[model samples]
Target: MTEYKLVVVGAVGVGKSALTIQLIQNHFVDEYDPTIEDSYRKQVVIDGETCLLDILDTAGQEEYSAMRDQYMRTGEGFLCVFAINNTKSFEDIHHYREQIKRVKDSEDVPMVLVGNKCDLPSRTVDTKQAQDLARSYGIPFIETSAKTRQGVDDAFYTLVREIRKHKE
Candidate 1:
């Protein structure tokens, strides 16, 4: 099976767990599962490519900052996540990008800036800001909602495709 390491980085309550859970189990939880400590591992088959998805879903807590950075060491791809309803989380997206660059020592990391939680239009963050940010970084952007299961597959599979495209 093809194996790839991916990291999902975001602030607390920004829905990193929900996004990863949606991709892995097709499920969503309204309450945060605090019992989940450290990274969660799983496997997935994407577009016929069976891959051991070493998805590092780190704790969103401030104390886990160092632990979070450790996962970046092995990540083949990056999923810098934010919530569309939370602009502060979206603002923190660059810090995640910077952290990854500092660890990888490569400014051009294969990444997808994901604005999660698109199911709530009332609480929407400016889509143009996200698009511009992605444009400036030259990475594609997608908005996802685990609650409605909208664009969840595309967000993940597109990241897979982008990583595969760079293989050549």
Candidate 2:
């Protein structure tokens, strides 16, 4: 089986687990439980070929910062996540991007800059600014909501496409 390791990273309460669970199980949870580090496996067919996604849903707390590099080293692609409702979370995405680039030693590494919680009533991060940053970093940018299941699948698919391109 073709397997790809994808790491999800961001600050606390940014909905990394929510997005991961939405993709893997097509389900959403209302509780705001923090994840230390959790792994999930899902099989998906992309472009008529079956693939296995070994996803690491990372902890958002700053205390787990030490573990991020290890995850970065193992991942073939990354989802640098943030919540649109939280400005701090959006601001910290640069650190995540830099960490991955440093660990992987590649400027063109496959990654997706995701702004989650698009369904929330309040949004602190502007879509244009997020898109501009993604463009500057040469990565795909997408907004998603686990609650409404909006743009969630597209984000994963975009990362998978980038991963395939990187492998090629």
Candidate 3:
């Protein structure tokens, strides 16, 4: 199986772990586990081909931000996550994107701009603005709800597709 090393990055409490677990475990974690960093593996079919996803769920807090570069260096693709209800988290996406591009030494990378926690009715970030950001980055923009499992799979699958497209 083809393996993809994907890194999930964003501001703390943006539900990076939630999105990762929902895809891997098919369920949401209600309790905040205070994650530092964790990696997961799962086998699945993407576009009629068997694929393996190696997901790194990284800590978003500033204390652990120092270690983000290591994962960025090794990651083939990235899910830049932000919460719909949290504006600061949305703003933080730029930093993550900047760091990844700097580490990867290329602006053309397989990546997706993810707006997570879309299940929440209370919203702050506008959908139009998010699409604009993704347009600026020349990548796909997806909104997901980890709790409800909406668009979770599509986000990762889209990144996987982008990974293939980059080399073509």
Clashes of each: 0, 0, 0
1 or 3, greater by TM-score: 3
**Alpha-carbon runs more than 4 Å astray in model 3:** 60-68
- Candidate 2 has its poorest 10 consecutive residues by lDDT at 60-69
- The CA lDDT at 38 in model 3 is 87
Report lDDT (CA) for all predictions: 0.80, 0.88, 0.89
* Model 2 lDDT tens row, 36-140: 578899999877768899999887446544556666689999999999989999889998888888988888889999999998888889999899999999999
lDDT of 3 by residue, 1-168 (tens): 999899988988888888888999998998657656888999999999799999989863564354566656899999999999999998988988888889889988799999998889889999999999999999999999999999999999999999999868
Q: Give me the candidate number with maximum lDDT.
A: 3
Per-prediction TM-score to the true structure, in the order listed: 0.88, 0.92, 0.94
Clash pairs, model 2 backbone: none
What is the alpha-carbon RMSD of candidate 1 to the true structure? 2.1
In the range 1-168, model 1's lDDT, one tens digit per residue, is 887777888888888888888777789978867446445566778999887776777563565356556656688888888988888998898888888888878876789989888888576578899999999999999988888889888887787787897786
